[PDB]
Amino acid sequence: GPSFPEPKVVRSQGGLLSLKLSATPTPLAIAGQRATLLTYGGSFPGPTLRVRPRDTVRLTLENRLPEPTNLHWHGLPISPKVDDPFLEIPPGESWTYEFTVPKELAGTFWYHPHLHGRVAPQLFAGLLGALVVESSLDAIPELREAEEHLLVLKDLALQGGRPAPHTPMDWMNGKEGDLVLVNGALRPTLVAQKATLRLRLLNASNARYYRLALQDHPLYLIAADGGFLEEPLEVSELLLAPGERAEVLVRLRKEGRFLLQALPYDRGAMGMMDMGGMAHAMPQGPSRPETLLYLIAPKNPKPLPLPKALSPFPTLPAPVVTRRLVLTEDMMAARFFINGQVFDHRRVDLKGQAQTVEVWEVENQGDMDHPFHLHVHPFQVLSVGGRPFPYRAWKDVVNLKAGEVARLLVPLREKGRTVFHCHIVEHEDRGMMGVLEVG
Amino acid sequence: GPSFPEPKVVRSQGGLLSLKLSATPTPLAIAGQRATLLTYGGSFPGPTLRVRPRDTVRLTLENRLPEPTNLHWHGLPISPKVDDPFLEIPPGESWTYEFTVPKELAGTFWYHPHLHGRVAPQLFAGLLGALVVESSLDAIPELREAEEHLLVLKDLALQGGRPAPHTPMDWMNGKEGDLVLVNGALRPTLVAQKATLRLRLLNASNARYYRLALQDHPLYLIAADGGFLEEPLEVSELLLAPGERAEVLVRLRKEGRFLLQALPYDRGAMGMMDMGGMAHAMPQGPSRPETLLYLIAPKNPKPLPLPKALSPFPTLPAPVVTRRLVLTEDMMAARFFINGQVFDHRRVDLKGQAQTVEVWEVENQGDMDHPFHLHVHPFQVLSVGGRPFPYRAWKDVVNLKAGEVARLLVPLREKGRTVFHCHIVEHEDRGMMGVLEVG
Ligand SMILES: [Cu+2]
Ligand SMILES: [Cu+2]
Ligand SMILES: [Cu+2]
Ligand SMILES: [Cu+2]
Ligand SMILES: [Cu+2]
Ligand SMILES: [Cu+2]
Ligand SMILES: [O-]
Ligand SMILES: [O-]
C-alpha cells in the first residue's frame, strides 16, 4: 500500500453520510504483531468520516462489546440530545445518531466512547476515529496545492495479545503505553511528494502528551481544535494534550530525512518509592523522547507561499456571567474533583442561558496537567497562566499545568444537559466531570 | 409647640435602642380635623428612631390591627432573617426585631408594613416612621452648625373620619390623596433660625411623587437613599419617588418667605373617558402644583460654606453576572409583572452569591413610572435612560420612566431569601415583586 498509512475515508454522498459501524473485538496486525483490539468498522483507528457543512450524518452504532457503550462527537457544536453523554447502548443493541453539520464549521474532530466509568479502558483498547469537516477555505491555492495527511497520535500497550489492563497507578495518572503509534503504525515513513504538507493532527491517547517538533523546521499552525486561526502562526514546537487537535503547514526546506518527534514533557505523572521509611509519591519526571515518523523531503523542495489569511474569528457579544471552576486531586485515592465534588449524573452544576456568552475561569490547583474539555459549546481561550493566547480560534480542550488559570470565552449554543470534564479519561471516569444545563 | 412639627425622636441609650411599638387604630387630630388612623406609637408619622453604627436595635412590634402585619426596615443592609418580608404577625400577637446597625452606614431610612396584598391600605392609613443613622460625618462644622429637620412627605385622603378606601382605579394607579402633608401637618411654616438648613427628606407616600423645588433657591444634595454622596451636588429641583430619601443643604440667600413646592409631574397615572364609543384609558397628565411648606429666612442670612467633601464611595469589585428584569403592565386588570410573571412567595427568581457584585439592568416597558426597590442589598445607580448618574452614593429605590433602562451595580451582602418590587405599593400588592436568594 501507500508508504504512509492513514485510516480509510468515508465521504458523504449527495449531502448524506449514512453508515453503520460496529464496535467489536477485532483480531488485527498491529506494529508487527497480532492483537485483538476493540475497533469501530474493523480497523484501528476507525474510519475517517469526511463531511461538509450542512451535510446530514446518519450513523448507526451497533454494540458488539460485552459491555455498554455510546459515542461522543468530540468537538461538534450539535445538540446534546444527539451527542448525549448519558445514553447507554447495551451489548447487542444499536442506536442511530442523526444530525446536520453546522454551517459555520471547519476542522478536525473525532468520535469515541463516553460511558462514565468505562471510557478509559474502551478508548485505550482502540475505540476511536476522526471526522473531518471540509471547508470552502480548502480551495484556496495555498491549501489546495498542499499534500494533506491525517496523523492520529495514539499509544498502546499489549499483554497476551490484548490491550494491557489498567493498574491502580493507571487510574491515578492516566494510562500511557510503550507503543507510540501514528495511525496505528509504528514510526511510519512519509515520503513527501510536495514541498508543502498540510497535516491534521489528533491526540487520541488516554493520557500521553505530544510535544511535537519536526527536526530543522518550524510548524505553521492554521487550525486549533474546532476551527481555523485568523492567519497562520509560526511555532517552534506544538504541545498536543489528550483530546486536542491542530492543523499545521510544513514547508520543507531542503532534501533529506527529518524526524517528527514527541519531545520530553513532564505532565506531572507520579510513581511510588520506598527509601527506608518512605513509601510515598515521587514525580515520574519528563517523558522519554519518541520518534513519531520519518519525513522524507522531495528533491529541490520549493514550498508554496503561506496563505495571508484564513478565517476571521467571530466578534462575540459581551459576556453575562463569570464562572470559576477549580480542579483538585486526591492522588492516592485516584479521586479527582471540580469545585470539591465528583461527578453525579443527577446533579446540575451550572445553569446558563442559550445564546449568551460566559467567561469561564478554570483553575488547576492540582500538581498534574489537566486538559479541560467542554462538550457542545466550543470556546475561545483568552489566556492561560496569565499569558494571553497568541491567536483566536475555536477550541474545546484546554491544557492547564499545575497552578494555571485558563480564562475562556464560552458562547452557549444548543439547549440541553451536557458535561465538562478532564480529558485524561481515567480522571473523568474517576470523578473529574460536571454537568452544565443550558436553557 | 415648635412652629415646625416633626415626629418625636427616640434615641439609642448606651448603644441600645429597646422599644415596644404598637400598631393600632388611633383617634387623632390631623390637618385640622379628627380622624382615626393606623399608627405606630400612637402618632402619625410614627416616632423617628435615631441610632449610630454598631448600636443594637430591639424593637417589639405589637399588632393591635384586625389584620396581620409585619415590618420592613426599608434600606437597612441587614439580614433578611430579621428584615423578613414573609413573616406574618397575627392580630393580637407580637414579634421582636433585633439587629445590629452596620458599621459603614449613614443616612435616612424608614419602617413600614410589608405583608403582601395588604401593604397599600396599611401604609396609606398611616403606618410608617423614620430611622436616622447618625454619622461621625455629622460632626464636621459645615453640617454640625446647620439647622437640621426631617421632612416626611406623605399624602392622605379622608372619608367619614377614616382613611379613604381603595377603589379599583387606585389599585391600578397607586392611591394619591388630596391632603398633601409634611410630618402629618398641612403646609407648616418653618421659621429658620440659621442660614444653612440640613433637610432629611422621605417620600413615605403610596404613589405620589414630589418634584421638589424651593422658590429662588437651588438645593445641595448631600445624601441619597442609603448614604452620603462623595461631595455636594447642586440641583435646581429634586424628584423624590415613593420610598426614596435624600438629604439636602439649603443656603438661605436673603430674608423673606420662600415656598417649598411639589411641582407638576406626570408619572403616567390613568383615568377613563367615554366620548361617544370610547370607554377607554386616558392619561391623567401632570399633578397639580402643591405647596409643601412655607420657609421663612432669618434676618441677614449668611450661610456656612458647603463641605468640600462628604464620604468617598467604596471601590467595588468587578461584577460576576448581569441580570435583566423587565417591568410590564396590564392596566385594565391592574396586574403588574416582572419578566412576564407575578409574585409567588414559593418561587425563587434569581439566585446570587454573597460578596459578589452583579449588574442589574431594569427596564420599564410600561407607560407608568415605576420606582424599583431591592431589599437588603443597597446598589449604585450607574445610569438611567442611558444617562450616567451624576454622583456616586448608595440607593435602594430607583425611578424608571416609561421606556427607561436603569443600570445598577448590586453588591450582594447578607445571605437569605429577600424580595425586589415596585414601590408604588399597590403595584407590589398586585404582583410586581420577585424573589432573590443569596447563598
Ligand atoms: Cu473526546
Ligand atoms: Cu485530569
Ligand atoms: Cu466528554
Ligand atoms: Cu419601603
Ligand atoms: Cu409600579
Ligand atoms: Cu419591600
Ligand atoms: O469527550
Ligand atoms: O419596601
Side-chain angles (χ1 to χ4, degrees):
Chain A
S3 171
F4 192 69
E6 284 175 85
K8 168 185 181 60
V9 172
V10 178
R11 289 160 290 273
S12 58
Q13 309 291 137
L16 169 66
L17 203 164
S18 175
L19 176 69
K20 318 296 187 173
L21 289 183
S22 293
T24 309
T26 300
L28 47 67
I30 176 101
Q33 42 208 117
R34 283 211 73 90
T36 299
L37 304 190
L38 301 184
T39 68
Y40 296 120
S43 66
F44 173 70
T48 295
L49 309 182
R50 191 175 174 107
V51 298
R52 308 165 74 259
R54 311 246 238 168
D55 274 357
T56 297
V57 172
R58 188 172 299 136
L59 190 298
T60 300
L61 180 59
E62 182 193 16
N63 180 10
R64 305 183 45 184
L65 309 179
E67 58 185 56
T69 194
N70 68 13
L71 280 180
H72 173 41
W73 295 91
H74 180 130
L76 287 184
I78 57 175
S79 166
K81 311 287 292 186
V82 175
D83 182 27
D84 184 350
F86 311 108
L87 174 82
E88 297 194 8
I89 307 171
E93 301 298 309
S94 295
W95 182 254
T96 299
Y97 293 93
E98 178 164 341
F99 62 89
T100 297
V101 184
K103 179 186 156 200
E104 294 291 322
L105 189 65
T108 307
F109 304 85
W110 62 306
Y111 58 95
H112 63 78
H114 189 268
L115 197 45
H116 175 66
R118 319 172 192 266
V119 179
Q122 288 188 15
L123 177 61
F124 193 76
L127 292 166
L128 75 306
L131 181 145
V132 173
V133 182
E134 286 197 334
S135 169
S136 52
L137 195 60
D138 295 334
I140 75 176
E142 297 88 343
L143 301 180
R144 189 56 163 90
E145 299 298 311
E147 166 174 337
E148 172 184 339
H149 295 280
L150 172 63
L151 279 62
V152 179
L153 308 177
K154 191 264 190 271
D155 60 335
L156 187 63
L158 292 171
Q159 187 172 297
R162 294 185 138 70
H166 272 64
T167 65
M169 178 164 301
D170 289 336
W171 287 109
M172 177 183 74
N173 287 320
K175 191 170 184 68
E176 301 187 56
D178 63 293
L179 301 166
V180 189
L181 308 179
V182 172
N183 299 334
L186 183 64
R187 302 188 282 275
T189 303
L190 195 165
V191 185
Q193 292 176 75
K194 301 240 194 73
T196 296
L197 307 174
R198 178 186 181 171
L199 309 180
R200 306 194 190 247
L201 312 167
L202 165 64
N203 181 348
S205 300
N206 280 221
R208 180 173 291 269
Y209 280 60
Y210 300 84
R211 180 177 163 221
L212 295 175
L214 181 59
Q215 284 181 326
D216 209 33
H217 290 76
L219 308 173
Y220 298 91
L221 186 63
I222 66 166
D225 303 329
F228 290 108
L229 278 58
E230 300 192 279
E231 67 190 348
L233 179 68
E234 184 187 78
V235 298
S236 55
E237 61 178 59
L238 180 65
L239 182 72
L240 222 57
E244 286 188 313
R245 291 86 67 209
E247 305 191 6
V248 298
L249 294 170
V250 174
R251 304 181 79 242
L252 296 164
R253 71 201 309 263
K254 67 199 174 178
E255 297 168 29
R257 186 204 73 161
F258 303 94
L259 295 181
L260 178 63
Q261 289 176 291
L263 298 177
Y265 185 73
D266 189 349
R267 68 180 179 91
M270 302 291 294
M272 295 292 299
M273 74 163 30
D274 176 359
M275 290 285 155
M278 299 272 134
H280 66 335
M282 303 293 287
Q284 295 194 178
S287 59
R288 74 195 254 20
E290 301 282 348
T291 291
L292 299 173
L293 59 73
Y294 302 99
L295 178 44
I296 310 305
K299 200 157 303 295
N300 301 320
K302 312 299 304 101
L304 313 164
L306 290 171
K308 296 74 218 166
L310 298 161
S311 295
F313 191 77
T315 312
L316 300 179
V320 298
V321 57
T322 286
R323 312 240 182 223
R324 176 169 188 256
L325 299 170
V326 177
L327 312 179
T328 54
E329 304 159 345
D330 184 346
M331 294 292 281
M332 298 299 91
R335 287 297 176 185
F336 298 94
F337 312 93
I338 307 178
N339 290 340
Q341 299 182 297
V342 300
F343 174 69
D344 183 343
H345 68 278
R346 304 163 308 179
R347 187 184 72 225
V348 175
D349 301 311
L350 306 180
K351 297 184 192 288
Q353 186 176 343
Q355 280 65 68
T356 65
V357 182
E358 308 196 337
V359 172
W360 287 28
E361 295 175 334
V362 183
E363 179 180 1
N364 182 4
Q365 282 183 190
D367 290 335
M368 302 188 73
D369 286 29
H370 300 283
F372 181 86
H373 174 53
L374 172 60
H375 289 207
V376 173
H377 316 276
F379 50 74
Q380 182 192 349
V381 179
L382 296 182
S383 61
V384 184
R387 318 178 291 272
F389 240 51
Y391 62 83
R392 309 198 289 168
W394 293 114
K395 282 182 54 61
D396 51 62
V397 179
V398 58
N399 196 52
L400 299 181
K401 294 208 58 81
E404 294 191 328
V405 175
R407 297 191 339 101
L408 315 181
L409 198 54
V410 189
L412 300 179
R413 306 196 195 179
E414 286 289 326
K415 295 175 172 174
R417 291 193 176 183
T418 188
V419 293
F420 45 87
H421 61 89
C422 184
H423 218 290
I424 289 161
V425 289
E426 285 80 357
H427 296 175
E428 164 277 311
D429 282 336
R430 292 292 291 174
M432 201 178 245
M433 176 154 60
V435 175
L436 160 71
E437 188 167 57
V438 176
Chain B
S3 171
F4 192 69
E6 284 175 85
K8 168 185 181 60
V9 172
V10 178
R11 289 160 290 273
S12 58
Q13 309 291 137
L16 169 66
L17 203 164
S18 175
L19 176 69
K20 318 296 187 173
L21 289 183
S22 293
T24 309
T26 300
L28 47 67
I30 176 101
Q33 42 208 117
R34 283 211 73 90
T36 299
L37 304 190
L38 301 184
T39 68
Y40 296 120
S43 66
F44 173 70
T48 295
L49 309 182
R50 191 175 174 107
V51 298
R52 308 165 74 259
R54 311 246 238 168
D55 274 357
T56 297
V57 172
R58 188 172 299 136
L59 190 298
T60 300
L61 180 59
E62 182 193 16
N63 180 10
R64 305 183 45 184
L65 309 179
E67 58 185 56
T69 194
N70 68 13
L71 280 180
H72 173 41
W73 295 91
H74 180 130
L76 287 184
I78 57 175
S79 166
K81 311 287 292 186
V82 175
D83 182 27
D84 184 350
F86 311 108
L87 174 82
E88 297 194 8
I89 307 171
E93 301 298 309
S94 295
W95 182 254
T96 299
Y97 293 93
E98 178 164 341
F99 62 89
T100 297
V101 184
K103 179 186 156 200
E104 294 291 322
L105 189 65
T108 307
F109 304 85
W110 62 306
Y111 58 95
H112 63 78
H114 189 268
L115 197 45
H116 175 66
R118 319 172 192 266
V119 179
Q122 288 188 15
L123 177 61
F124 193 76
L127 292 166
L128 75 306
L131 181 145
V132 173
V133 182
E134 286 197 334
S135 169
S136 52
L137 195 60
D138 295 334
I140 75 176
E142 297 88 343
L143 301 180
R144 189 56 163 90
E145 299 298 311
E147 166 174 337
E148 172 184 339
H149 295 280
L150 172 63
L151 279 62
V152 179
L153 308 177
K154 191 264 190 271
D155 60 335
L156 187 63
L158 292 171
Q159 187 172 297
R162 294 185 138 70
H166 272 64
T167 65
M169 178 164 301
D170 289 336
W171 287 109
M172 177 183 74
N173 287 320
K175 191 170 184 68
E176 301 187 56
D178 63 293
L179 301 166
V180 189
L181 308 179
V182 172
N183 299 334
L186 183 64
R187 302 188 282 275
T189 303
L190 195 165
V191 185
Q193 292 176 75
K194 301 240 194 73
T196 296
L197 307 174
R198 178 186 181 171
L199 309 180
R200 306 194 190 247
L201 312 167
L202 165 64
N203 181 348
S205 300
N206 280 221
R208 180 173 291 269
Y209 280 60
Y210 300 84
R211 180 177 163 221
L212 295 175
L214 181 59
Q215 284 181 326
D216 209 33
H217 290 76
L219 308 173
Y220 298 91
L221 186 63
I222 66 166
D225 303 329
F228 290 108
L229 278 58
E230 300 192 279
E231 67 190 348
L233 179 68
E234 184 187 78
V235 298
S236 55
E237 61 178 59
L238 180 65
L239 182 72
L240 222 57
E244 286 188 313
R245 291 86 67 209
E247 305 191 6
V248 298
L249 294 170
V250 174
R251 304 181 79 242
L252 296 164
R253 71 201 309 263
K254 67 199 174 178
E255 297 168 29
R257 186 204 73 161
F258 303 94
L259 295 181
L260 178 63
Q261 289 176 291
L263 298 177
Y265 185 73
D266 189 349
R267 68 180 179 91
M270 302 291 294
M272 295 292 299
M273 74 163 30
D274 176 359
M275 290 285 155
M278 299 272 134
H280 66 335
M282 303 293 287
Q284 295 194 178
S287 59
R288 74 195 254 20
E290 301 282 348
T291 291
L292 299 173
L293 59 73
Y294 302 99
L295 178 44
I296 310 305
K299 200 157 303 295
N300 301 320
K302 312 299 304 101
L304 313 164
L306 290 171
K308 296 74 218 166
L310 298 161
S311 295
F313 191 77
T315 312
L316 300 179
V320 298
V321 57
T322 286
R323 312 240 182 223
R324 176 169 188 256
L325 299 170
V326 177
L327 312 179
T328 54
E329 304 159 345
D330 184 346
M331 294 292 281
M332 298 299 91
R335 287 297 176 185
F336 298 94
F337 312 93
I338 307 178
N339 290 340
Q341 299 182 297
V342 300
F343 174 69
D344 183 343
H345 68 278
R346 304 163 308 179
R347 187 184 72 225
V348 175
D349 301 311
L350 306 180
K351 297 184 192 288
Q353 186 176 343
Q355 280 65 68
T356 65
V357 182
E358 308 196 337
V359 172
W360 287 28
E361 295 175 334
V362 183
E363 179 180 1
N364 182 4
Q365 282 183 190
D367 290 335
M368 302 188 73
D369 286 29
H370 300 283
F372 181 86
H373 174 53
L374 172 60
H375 289 207
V376 173
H377 316 276
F379 50 74
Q380 182 192 349
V381 179
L382 296 182
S383 61
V384 184
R387 318 178 291 272
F389 240 51
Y391 62 83
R392 309 198 289 168
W394 293 114
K395 282 182 54 61
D396 51 62
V397 179
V398 58
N399 196 52
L400 299 181
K401 294 208 58 81
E404 294 191 328
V405 175
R407 297 191 339 101
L408 315 181
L409 198 54
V410 189
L412 300 179
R413 306 196 195 179
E414 286 289 326
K415 295 175 172 174
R417 291 193 176 183
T418 188
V419 293
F420 45 87
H421 61 89
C422 184
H423 218 290
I424 289 161
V425 289
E426 285 80 357
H427 296 175
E428 164 277 311
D429 282 336
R430 292 292 291 174
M432 201 178 245
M433 176 154 60
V435 175
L436 160 71
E437 188 167 57
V438 176

